[model samples]
Target chain A: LKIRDAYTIVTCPGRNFVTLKIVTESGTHGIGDATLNGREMAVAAYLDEHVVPALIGRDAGRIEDTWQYLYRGAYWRRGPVTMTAIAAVDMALWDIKAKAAGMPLYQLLGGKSRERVMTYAHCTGQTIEDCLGEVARHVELGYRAVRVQSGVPGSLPAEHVWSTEKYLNHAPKLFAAVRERFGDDLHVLHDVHHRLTPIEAARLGKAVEPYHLFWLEDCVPAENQESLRLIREHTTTPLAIGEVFNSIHDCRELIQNQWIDYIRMPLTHGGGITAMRRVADLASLYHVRTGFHGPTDLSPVCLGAAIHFDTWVPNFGIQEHMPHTDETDAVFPHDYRFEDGHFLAGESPGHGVDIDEELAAKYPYERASLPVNRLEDGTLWHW
Target chain B: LKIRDAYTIVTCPGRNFVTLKIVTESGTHGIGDATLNGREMAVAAYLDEHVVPALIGRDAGRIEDTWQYLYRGAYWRRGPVTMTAIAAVDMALWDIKAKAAGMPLYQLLGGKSRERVMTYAHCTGQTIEDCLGEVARHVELGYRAVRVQSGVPGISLPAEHVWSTEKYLNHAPKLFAAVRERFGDDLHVLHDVHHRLTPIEAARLGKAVEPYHLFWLEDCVPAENQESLRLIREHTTTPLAIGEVFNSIHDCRELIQNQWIDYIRMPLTHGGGITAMRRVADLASLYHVRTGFHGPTDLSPVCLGAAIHFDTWVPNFGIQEHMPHTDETDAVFPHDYRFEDGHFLAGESPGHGVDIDEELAAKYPYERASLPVNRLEDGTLWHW
Candidate 1:
């Protein structure tokens, strides 16, 4: 059970990904995702220069103790760099533990709470008609739930080339188009993308109430979690948040107050499954469900492990499905299967995912930074 | 106005310190504290491998834009590492801007709000008698405010030793009672619980110490939940302070807006230096809260120097924590900011009034050190 070797592999298969591979003296290996969008090198440096040297010869079986040692021993607790680094180490340990036990990660996490996990596909387009067509394309592919976005991958609607008034007016029109095209049974979700204010989001939540949307995600910049109290005060539109959050404490107030309905933290960003389980249990106390973030920024290793978490957690909600490029899937092979709109948790030993280091080395990492949004006056806004 | 070069220097005079230096194209170089207490190398790595490269050829005068660039541009926002790194950059930029203006950093922050800033000195001992002895010594030296702490009956805290919370709760009031009886109510006394108690326990301690009229009870309970402060706020009248562990304004918007805390302890280094700390102080003032910025030996002398400027300028000031640096540390970073009579005289020299002695700093090589972890009597990893 002793860790024989550990290292980070930074590869760019059309886009950048950071994976941490841990090999035990027992000869089995594990891979965990450590990709932080636009900040890949920071986490890589953390894992390589700081964390890697400490892992050799440590007992691989003691997952919780290792987590504490990394988290508490640093004295510098959770931040995206710290948490994301810890997340990779934790996922690797879980993968090692499950493989040693001769079972899948989900089964080790209390078996399957459900046979298959429900997932939502991201459907976005530049035009309303185009977006509706995209939604139809997914529905035909057997996706039960679809997240609708008019134009996206962005930020602050004001300082940049954006208009809040236009968005608020046009947001409902898109949802209305979805219901008009696909009917009410499609489970339509819309993301305001952390642009609107509490009151403005309340207005959108209220405006879109007649369409019966599945959920409204990232309605406001939720650094001030209490700001949701205002959105909740004006509307009962089932708020969803947490992708920007790296710690459970970030959403503790929102959850306990029942201001949010879904938590959007991916295991990759929130200190892996060990900490995510704590988030799941805490949210269950207040009836909040998990809606882990799924974006191309996170590697397939994270997505594979997330499906297992979604499979075992009793208070399960929908997992996001953002299909990766074929190039990415080739570099990281996995056993999880997507049948119809649902993802079937793999029965194979461990997390059922492995990185093809030989193939990955072909595509060297390139500096691919996220776009920065600016107001018309050049004031910086959230991207 | 352009930043020609930026780099991080890791030194361990006695304890480890991380300092970030930014040299402007105009030949004026400034240094800022990047130390993160026990986690020095992590922050140093963040500044060196990540931050320093981005800073080259940037407009050093656009302090706010640079801060936003480093902070939001990283795609990872505030954490101790990110914040400390951003703060070091922010502090260095402010230093450059102030030096360019030929005035102290506080002057750029709307001049002095008061004559000088009052400060509290920490006094700790193994017993209550030792604690009082230290307090009396500080009082005789003309210190106005003092923070008191006694080692728990058994072993030093944040260690492997068994902790007895009840024993400390019982002993705390008696320590305060002794301070008040001997000092005769003329001195200001403060105490830090070091984030060690339950909300109920914090409430009891707060209520118990009300008789002594404490200056403030600092970090009485772990504030990750934040609502814990409400219980302690309701249970006692002793002034409350928290936020030493907090890295952002968002971390304590609720704590301040609710008026649950009287003083905010987010200091210049851990919080984002003058540029961001000003925003926090402004938000806190609306709620009638004041700044009691975190100061300790672990923070480099650079942080303490920049902090003295902030303390002098911030209008809603309560007090500042003063932990004097070791002689070697003081020698490494020469500064004009110093203690006089019980107040910190924000030095009049340009750029936060501090300069790093790189040659002297290089003499002390970086060494590894870590803070102690806390465990309860039952072996629970409790917050302390």
Candidate 2:
């Protein structure tokens, strides 16, 4: 079958994302997202103008060659948008090819390696008491794992809180309170979110170690792996990273060295199933498990593809499960079920997600933006 | 006038960019682009929602403090969209503050560090012969520095031809061969690998080019300095340049200390402006290097403002990349960079460049889409 046309979409179901969809001549299609939070459109545009034209008359079955053609062929090899855009196309092609082969995308990867892919939900609050209540809600909802964060009361945009647990400037008393209240049984996660230095990250990790955390997400910035390795040596807390990864090479060393216990290359940010599968496969050998960063920013299309991968990959770990808003859920419908605490791979042929082109058109692409933050000294801080 | 509001814009003259424009209440404005070519919308939305809200009621004149607020206030530091988004808001506000004080943005950053911010333009062709001709045209147009690349004949969406030049599997012999044929020693040049190599592959490519002089080599491989510095030094005397994807100082220390590169190319996209710049400049100085910030689609006016500051303060200033946006973009941005032959100067206003028109920005928000690289099989390369 001939692959006729393709384009990318950046939708914020409730957050933000860069999504790519490929429609074939027979009206069959697949979708992928490579967006990293606020930069959703970069991946979308890369696929639209740069990647799609090359896919014009290619065979649907020649997946690896086409991937190489799109990748090695591009003079500018790797970066966020280029790779993410490539990821979108790669994922869509895989979706189409899998359906063409009369099987699910995961089946093509190697078949059902697991019954269901376990997922964790993100629960945040302005205070530890509120955070505990939210965590309790998630645990009560049958969530085996939950990532917890408390809002920095002083920080207007709690999402940008830039301090360690000990240096709680804005959202004070909440996390400490959560630790006091929650005890240790739940598989919990806390995001220092790169607000600490190596020593600070280690200190916080040490303090939270008593809480028995699943992993500290980006405890310190990820520019240097040695810093994380240093933190890992000091504390018993496991670490996870790669939420912002767009290329396999970005995390190759970190995964290879075992600095991180979990690799969170959400299929959307890396190039769909094709590239992400490669990343997951690479990590598998290193004993690093797959913990796809499935935030609400990603559309259901990404979730479906991710679930299929979660079902098939040997090193599958935990997936982020921040459900899309109702409006976004209505915008794109998928066949996967988020029953209990896990997502079942869609039984429908391809990636199991379909685009309501007519409805999507009616929404008439609107632009939304993310906020920026600064330190008290008037120096620009990292967002 | 009291501070009223602010917002952002994402535009692409050719769909290759995602520009972010910040507008203030008084009709003054500044613009920044954080688009990394293919992914324009991510930075756009970041400026729209994340950065826009913080600017409301905040004094446009408080550019640096506002920059800090947008940065540290977010708590979640440094990603392309996040940093680019901050750069957009900071840039727009500086623009507004400058316009409010009645001066261009660069003048506020200590005015005229050099005769101008010298810029480099891209000149590419399908063959070496054709590319040499294009280089001649750029040189004729008063471009002192030029980046060169040639097409792989008629390969559809041939990769490796994006803004910079990369040494592909073939050592880029066909393209550089022609470049050497013409423009011999008349131009300062740079090549961008776009991060496509293993250490060994990059070394091989470097050795092949000891004859032709190059200003710097960028993103040869995705390796950190620890892995690449020795390999690169072992091969060619070509100055290594990288850090386009970096946002923190931790990534710069070793690369700068080990002398793996001659220039630090960490532009304003991921670092916002000025904030991480101090660290980059300080470290590079100890290593006896220079600075060549990444400039293109994704950087915003805020980054330009900050870069002007860094360019002035840092003694290791080398050169900057200037890809001028068209008039439509100019109208929306209204920045204060004027080219004298091939150089640019910062405005002398109180704080950075043109003021942002937040009201206008609200009227036009960010949208989602990706820019594609049209390619052909047999894998010869071309750029968007």
Candidate 3:
């Protein structure tokens, strides 16, 4: 079958998203997320103007070749716009493929590696006491693992930037407090946010290991992959890197060297299902597991599509689940649901996500930007 | 001054183009080309929906920073869509900058290295005689160099297929050999393979054409697997030019660093305008590679003018491809760049010596036109 038509659906059901919908001449359609944080329209423009017209009347069964054609044929390789656009196209085709087979997307990737994909929850607050309270709240909600973050003492100023030293000193104490309060049953995760240096990351990793944490994430800025090797040598804490990564090539060294335990490329920013599957397959060879970055900024449709991926990947690790707004859920009506803190992949043909274009039109896009951060002395810091 | 508004002016005087117009708060305006061949609307949509909104109310003077902000800040780096959009912004800003300085865009790039940029012209025909006639026409038009291509003998069967390796191999060298015999050593020459050959076939063709002493051979083979060039290089002394399809330096890096090719073939339109083009040229400089950017009808007139400005200041300058646009295009885009003795030089007017008469442009609304797909002898698809 050939792709008869394709276009982008732009909406802001609480947060802006650019969704790619590819329809086959046989009436089958599938969706993929092209959300680029605050820059939704760029991807929308990419899909509506460039991708759709090129797609019309092309064979839909040429999924792999089509992915390569879009990726290599454009002559522009790895980048956020390129990958995200390719990812959207790839995700949509995979959805179509699964639907054509009359099975879940996961089944096409082989089969279920697990009954339900386990997900980690987030708990954040101003201080240890407030943070502990949020952790308890997640536990009560049936979370098996929780990611914990607390506001640094001096990080509450205008720009809301933190001191790396203060975070390093205070983080182990908070994890210790959680471990002391709830015992060892709960898996705890911490995000360094790429704030510390290699040596500093090592110290923090060593300090947190007694708590038997689930993982330490982005301990140091991962652009320089060698830094992760230093962090690995210093501590035995499992490392998970890559939320900002646009392609696997960015972290190929870390994955091949076996330095990072989990690869955290989210479906939205990481180039959708096609590229992500290639990354997952590469990582699986080195014992690396998939821990897709699923913050609330990614739409419900993105999370829904990712769950099917999580279900199928052979080297099952864990998923990061940050629930979206009620408006988001309503606009992106889906068959996937969270039960007992585990996300059950939809058995429906294709990815179980579908957008409510009519409801989506109601909430027009509004201008929003991710907050920036700086050091206490006003130096720029990664946010 | 701040950019008060920005919008895309899409027109098809003969072929498709996406032009970006940046209007400053002070009433001055500048234009750039974001044409992406088969994907003009993508850049138009990019400028209209995303880029334009973000550009309004920003400092027009911060051209360099703005290019970076749009590129790095987007979280997704380079691609045809991103670079073409960025190229449009970069060109418009440079136009604004040159206009603000009241000097030609070339002057801002640190003045001219040569009086005019030498360019090669294209000559194609169904037969060698017809092709030579076109070559004579270009030579009469003051072209110092020309690219020659002829219709294949057995493969000249309508539109279903345009390439046959055996026929192309038997026919191409004869055209060049004939052109050389007629024009003598006074005229420089070039050829485009359109990426139809295998490594061994490219080597054979390159070896056959060596007696002609051509300026450069372009797109000898598809460049995706760059290692393929090593085989072609081992067999021929002919200079290779690849990357008419390239959008970034990364695509040409392996080819450049390995010294597998003599020229970097990125166009100003496809390679992200003056900003990114300069970056690519700078990298190519270190590798002893020179610029021989892709120029065709697909690139708008605004792009041609901007390329001349770049060609002026680039340290490791080489030859340029010159494919003149339609008269309709010239009327819509009033430009200062002119050809004399097969070389183009920018006019002393501010900016890249080009601007759009929006009124004239609007007369020709956008028309859908795309590059054709290539098929092999047996109807199997090939790269277009």
Choose the strongest candidate by TM-score: 1
Q: Which stretches in model 1 have alpha-carbon errors above 4 Å? A: A1-7, A21-29, A47-62, A65-76, A152-160, A235-237, A357-364, B53-58, B69-75, B136-142, B156-162, B177-184
Per-candidate TM-scores read: 0.91, 0.74, 0.85
Candidate 1 lDDT, A271-309, residue by residue in tens: 998999999999999999999999899998999899899
Please tell me which predicted candidate would have the highest DockQ against the true structure. Answer: 1
CAPRI level of candidate 3: acceptable
Please list the residue runs of candidate 3 whose C-alpha ends up more than 4 Å from where it truly belongs after superposition: A1-7, A22-28, A53-62, A65-86, A125-136, A144-275, A286-288, A367-383, B153-175, B195-214, B220-236, B375-382
> By descending lDDT, how would the candidates be arranged?
1, 3, 2
Ranking by DockQ: 1, 3, 2
Candidate 3 collision pairs: A80-B76, A80-B77, A87-A271
- Give the per-residue lDDT digits (tens) of candidate 3, residues A1-383: 89998988888887787788889999999888888875566667666656677888878877877776676455445666667888888888888988999998888888888889899999999899899999999988988999999887751112445688778777888999998899998999998876788989889889988998889998876654667888899899999989878777678778988899999998877877878888999999999999999988787778988998898888878999999989989988888889888999988988888888899889888756554456777555666
| Candidate 1 global TM-score | 0.91
Residue-level lDDT of model 3, residues B51-120, one tens digit each, is 7877888899988767766764544456677788898999999999999999888899988888779999
Error of 2 at A222 (Å): 2.6
Model 1: how many Å of interface RMSD?
4.4
Model 1: chain B TM-score vs. truth? 0.97
DockQ of 2: 0.20
Q: What CA RMSD would you report for each candidate? A: 3.4, 6.4, 4.6
Local accuracy by lDDT, each model: 0.86, 0.65, 0.82
User: Judged by lDDT against the true structure, how good is candidate 2?
Assistant: 0.65
